[model samples]
Target: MEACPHIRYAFQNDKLLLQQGRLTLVNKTTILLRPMKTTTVDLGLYARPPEGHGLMLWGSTSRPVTSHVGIIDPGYTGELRLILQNQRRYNSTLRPSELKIHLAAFRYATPQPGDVGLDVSLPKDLALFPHQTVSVTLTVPPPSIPHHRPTIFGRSGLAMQGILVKPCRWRRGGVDVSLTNFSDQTVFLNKYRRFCQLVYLHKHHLTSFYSPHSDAGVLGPRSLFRWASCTFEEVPSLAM
Candidate 1:
């Protein structure tokens, strides 16, 4: 009998896989913002996996994934870029090989929906203290459907920066967004960056109706009475 085939797939966890190795940050990145300034950081990837294999980027497990988690979609075929924000009071350094980025292989679904793109940015680099908030105005053409409502949300990268996008009802002109820095560091926002997206959700409903005439009571003979007695008189001069 042929020897048993060597099993390559080892047991660790049902959802976990032991890849070849890990990717380490080669450079020591640092971010400095007064309080509410936003900036973008581009990450450089060392190599790319096979067609079906992809990487899931996230923060260190010990620390919150504040750097904004990102995904390497299958067949992306591009350098990995990360959007970073300083959400603390003082400046901080992103140590080399400190970020805990995960990798995996999987498949996903693809279904397109109607979307309205809007530009999110700050007029000037905002300086916001801890627990402070700022507002940014994004002008985009309203959705074609009148009844459909638009929802605003931070892109995956933005959310990793401890920044959040509040939902707003689309109005005639545009949308006003409130950005809050939940971390202690100062956050920096860039101009004309696609930080958020506006998606239109179509409203759904059922139809039904009722009429009073269909259920009204029938009329009775007495209800429809005859004409009342009348009197007629003629003027004497007019008659002669």
Candidate 2:
């Protein structure tokens, strides 16, 4: 009973339930997410991280629902919301019916100013050609604790241009991130345009890893995948 209330000593289940307005979303039904945009999913639940721990949110491996990485910072309370991203060149719909999320209770060994929402993007004036991949070194703000290099984990689905960033980590500043252009046309990355998130962690016993694969540099896919592709023509929605 002496331990901090934020640090639970009692046992708790690790399963998460997905609910939507008097109805549950898992096992049937779907949600619509725009192309190269961000969506918010109301979790309809409340959570508070442990004193030294936060949550590392992972999307399903086979599907794009919650495919982006997310974090619930330490000690946060109230309703939980997920920042979802659509990395495909066209609009996408997903079924949470069988969506699987892997939530990890991540521990931070060092002290934080407490708010660690680090979504980083490329600096001004950067471009990627068709089927191009480049490593861009990011400029992170100076550490809060001097000389205390924090461990940073790169979370996906921050960029709104359908760019895929390789998941990686480092314990230093100026992370060299690999950005690949998955679309057929040239893409532009605005300065400080958020594409991914970073979480500060110490270390964990079990590590979940994802392998980055090579995409064959080819032209765009056929009509089946291109029917709803992103377009440059202005739509009322774009003006809205």
Candidate 3:
């Protein structure tokens, strides 16, 4: 029989929820959270080192030396402290004027409850503004299990983007999609590389006008295209 999974909880009011954007690492930093709702939260390390082309997960081996990499439980409220390392060759400093971290809204999920809302309280010394995402740190409870499917959510600072679809479990076929821009400045494409396999599915691919040609003449910010919808049914058997 499968052992009972450890029940998780988040802090009330997110008591220690940190403020997003504009962080200053003078020697050390500490943050707090106050959960507005309750749900599970997991921690993962994502880094974009100077030499790397893109970001990469630090793996499951260890947490970042500075941040709390764990899970947050429901109805939890507490403080989180972070200690940054000064590993630069010179006496480097991260001033308040240098960089900002965007705190995006996250959706938390679990078998017990659904997506939990994030409640972030502002600090008096910091100048808070709209459009800034909420920053968070997660804490894991004792008794670590070997569960690959994480139960936590809405507790990450990575800029990574992707999606997962499970249509079969929900009485539909699962379909996943992803888009990436690999060029400096925003690159636009006139058309997409259509998959012939998708031809049978009656699926109309969404068109994006952000291609190089469309963006060439347009001035200011604007979306240049429309979507095309096509639908189809699953193949009974491809091999047969």
Per-model TM-score on C-alpha atoms: 0.36, 0.53, 0.20
Model 1 error, position 175 (Å):
2.3
**Best-to-worst ranking by lDDT:** 2, 1, 3
Model 2 stretches astray by more than 4 angstroms: 1-27, 64-66, 111-113, 117-125, 128-134, 138-166, 171-174, 179-198, 205-240
Regions of candidate 1 where Cα sits further than 4 Å from its true position: 1-124, 205-240
lDDT (10s digit) by residue, model 1, range 1-240: 121222111122222222232332333443333334444445434233333232334334232224443445444544555545555655555554444343222222222311233434454455555567787776755446554445444565665556755434455687677676755677666565666655443221101223221111111111211111111121223211
Total clashing pairs for each candidate: 16, 4, 34
List the RMSD of every prediction in angstroms: 30.1, 13.4, 23.0
Q: What is the C-alpha lDDT of each candidate?
A: 0.40, 0.46, 0.19
Candidate 2 on 1-240: residue-level lDDT in tens?
122233221111223354320112242446677754566555544444545556554455245443444566764554444555555667677664555443344444444437455666556656888547787776655355443234334443433344556555543556666766655568876777775556545432123332122111110111010000111121222111
Model 3 misplaced stretches (Cα beyond 4 Å) = 1-73, 80-83, 87-90, 111-240
TM-score rank, highest first?
2, 1, 3
Winning candidate number (TM-score): 2
